[PDB]
Amino acid sequence: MDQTQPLNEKQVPNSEGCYVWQVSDMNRLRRFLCFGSEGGTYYIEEKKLGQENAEALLRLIEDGKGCEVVQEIKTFSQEGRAAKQEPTLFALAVCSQCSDIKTKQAAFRAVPEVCRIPTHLFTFIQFKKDLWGRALRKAVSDWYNTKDALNLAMAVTKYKQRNGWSHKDLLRLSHIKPANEGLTMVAKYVSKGWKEVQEAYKEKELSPETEKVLKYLEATERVKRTKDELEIIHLIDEYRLVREHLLTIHLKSKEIWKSLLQDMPLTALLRNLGKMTADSVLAPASSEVSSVCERLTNEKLLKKARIHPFHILVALETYKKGHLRWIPDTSIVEALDNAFYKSFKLVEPTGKRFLLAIDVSASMNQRVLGSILNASVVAAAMCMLVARTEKDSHMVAFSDEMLPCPITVNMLLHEVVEKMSDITMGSTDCALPMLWAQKTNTAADIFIVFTDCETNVEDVHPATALKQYREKMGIPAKLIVCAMTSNGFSIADPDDRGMLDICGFDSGALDVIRNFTLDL
């Protein structure tokens, strides 16, 4: 029996016509939350991949798991497990208009929490349009009324974009009734303007909290009336204004940028590394560079700034590239490598024996999350994560034959990326890691295969190779399939308790791995 034939009646043909199992709908939802469907996969066009994922979600609802889905969405968003919020927002939108009364209600109830920032709310609304009753108005009203007025003021005072997204419109369409004076004030600022706010609040008794909102709006307005660097720096120092609150002429100043650098939100810092280096703002051997390195390697700050490991991987590739042109600062490059590991949810090692196998076949050249990184690079980063936490780990690579592993656990992340950028090619035999481990009599308690599961060679099924490995070696080895796309295929036998499906770049993947490895 080989891969071109069905192991049993539950198998389905993959893109290459070979047999695998359909990953469970709940696990496909997780694959979707983590990878989305932008750019599709090597074998599946973008729109089709999105529809496949939307259909899986619809089956879940149809099967009564609607509320479980919404709970899962809230959980991923709260724990910051996914690199992008789009998939999560699309899934929430789908749930807010489905056939299940209870799921609709649960979806709407989750909008204020799942839509963490303005962009999210706007994206969520656009998806609902894609797909204003009392429920939507209440949800939107709830979103504004549950946010901190000062934080809202901070967001609405940044420069606007011509993307059709308007707070003025949402405040109107939602028929909102502001719950506190600070929100009433910001709503007035958005709908009527600064002059109106000033006039409505002159002579007015305000709590110290509402007063802070008024003084902050005043600060953002003062920015526009001056080109004096010292005055602007004082405003950044006292009110923590960011780049988007400033005039273009202000952004021409190196000192203003240094003041902006001081408390720059980590996500913005990651995006501005190259520019600030080219601009001499992050000069070699500078205290500016040192502070940056310290903020990036502070696990508590990364978590609070919701920095996902994929954000760091992408930021690193972009920065190391050097082009706008700059000399990538070596200490920052090292800091990013360090931050990558600290951004995943850390767990105690299992001390077991791991065989980590990276698929470097042709289809793995497929791009991940709309980035320039291909699936083999991303898989390599996941493999490094595991190897770094589990001392007893041996890394291997494969296509339709075992291949020398281009990476070693001691390499820095930027090196891993370089080595894996053009390594993809050839057919795919997902049974190889187990077969190779057997032939070479290498001991492993856990096999983790990083792949898209599009196996397609006339060799034994990977599930088969695992069982043969178990028997011959006398080890009850488990197989963890770390999916690298949101397709719906899996080489793991749903009927074998010793096999599990997980998803690459789920920031809490190590916890899933730990629990399965120790039957916790």
From Swiss-Prot:
In this chain, the stretch annotated as VWFA-like domain covers 344-520
For this record, an example GO cellular component is: cytoplasm
Q: List keywords of the entry alphabetically.
A: Cilium biogenesis/degradation, Cytoplasm, Metal-binding, Ribonucleoprotein, RNA-binding
Check the record and name the InterPro entries matching this protein.
TROVE2 (IPR040322), TROVE_dom (IPR008858), TROVE_dom_sf (IPR037214), vWA_Ro60 (IPR056800), vWFA_dom_sf (IPR036465)
Please state every residue range assigned to the domain named TROVE.
12-352
- Give me the ranges of the annotated region RNA-binding: 116-272
- GO terms assigned for molecular function: metal ion binding; misfolded RNA binding; RNA binding
- GO annotations under biological process? cell projection organization
Give me the residues that bind a divalent metal cation, please: S361, S363, T428
Q: Where in the cell is it found?
A: Cytoplasm
Pfam families, sorted: TROVE, vWA_Ro60
Q: What is its main location?
A: cytoplasm
Q: What does this protein do?
A: RNA-binding protein that binds to misfolded non-coding RNAs, pre-5S rRNA, and several small cytoplasmic RNA molecules known as Y RNAs. May play roles in cilia formation and/or maintenance.
Instruction: Tell me the protein family, please.
Output: Belongs to the Ro 60 kDa family.
Q: What is known of its domains?
A: The horseshoe-shaped TROVE domain is built with 7 helical HEAT-like repeats, and is closed by the VWFA-like domain giving rise to a ring-shaped monomer. Single-stranded RNA is bound in the positively charged central cavity.
Name under which the protein is recorded: RNA-binding protein RO60
Q: Which gene encodes it?
A: ro60
